[PDB]
């Protein structure tokens, strides 16, 4: 279901990205960032634009924001376009 079942350290599925997203979450951000690949010079793949602006969901913004810095990216701006704040029920 959601990503906070009871998993933490020392648990059977591997220790990973745990987001505070509810059941079928409907909140999503509008993020903007550059993310240079830092791996094209030994792989020699084709080049793709690294400056992107896209709507990521609340269910997986934290994983994406945690990963964009993994590969040296810089986050220029993020906002919560869709969803409420301090909302107990209704994020579903």
């Amino acid at each position: 279901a959601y990503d906070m079942d009871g998993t933490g350290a020392g648990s059977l599925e591997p220790r990973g990205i745990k987001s505070s997203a509810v059941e079928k979450d409907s909140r999503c951000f509008k993020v903007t960032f550059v993310l240079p690949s830092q791996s094209r010079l030994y792989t020699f793949r084709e080049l793709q634009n690294v400056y992107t602006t896209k709507m990521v969901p609340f269910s997986s913004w934290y994983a994406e924001q945690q990963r964009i810095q993994k590969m040296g990216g810089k986050i220029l701006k993020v906002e919560l376009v869709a969803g409420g704040q301090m909302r107990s029920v209704g994020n579903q």
Binding site: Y2, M4, D5, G6, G8, S20, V22, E23, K24, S26, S88, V89, G90, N91, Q92
Partner: protein, 160 residues
């Protein structure tokens, strides 16, 4: 509620609501008169449902209240009953919403992280909700006790 997730179900599928979805929103709102009566019973029985709820909880789990238990002393025992007042409140929300969606994103999502991080035995708080369930279903008829008890055991399932 059943209205909001029957929508977001058909929302994701790029379609409207089927008869299977619209004959149940219909069936739920005619059920709404009976739901408020059930939640009205638990609303002003929280004095007995909570206090007798913590009654059986300490008789079944004296460790948590004994010296060394998490709810030891005048202080923690008050908060020991405070959480039961919380979860008894969320069950009143689930009965009126016709689903554990209110109980889902309040008191259930990531609950093991909180209680593990508070040092509280999560199995102990599960025992507390079960003791409240026998008090709650003892206050209602058989047709209602299949509902009010029905939301407690979901909270029991997610709390372990």
């Amino acid at each position: 509620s059943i209205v909001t997730k029957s929508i977001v179900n058909a929302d994701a599928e790029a379609r409207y609501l089927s008869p299977g979805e619209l004959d149940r929103i219909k069936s739920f709102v005619l059920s709404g008169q009976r739901r408020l009566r059930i939640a009205q019973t638990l609303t002003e029985n929280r004095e007995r449902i909570v206090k007798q709820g913590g009654q059986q909880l300490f008789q079944r789990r004296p460790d948590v209240v004994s010296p060394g238990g998490n709810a030891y002393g005048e202080e923690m025992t008050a908060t020991c009953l405070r959480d039961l007042d919380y979860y008894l409140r969320l069950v009143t929300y689930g009965i009126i919403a016709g689903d554990v969606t209110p109980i889902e994103e309040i008191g259930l999502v990531g609950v093991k992280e909180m209680y593990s991080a508070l040092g509280t035995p999560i199995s102990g708080v599960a025992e507390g909700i079960r003791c409240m369930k026998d008090v709650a279903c003892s206050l209602l008829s058989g047709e209602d006790a299949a509902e009010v008890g029905f939301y407690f055991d979901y909270t029991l399932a997610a709390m372990q």
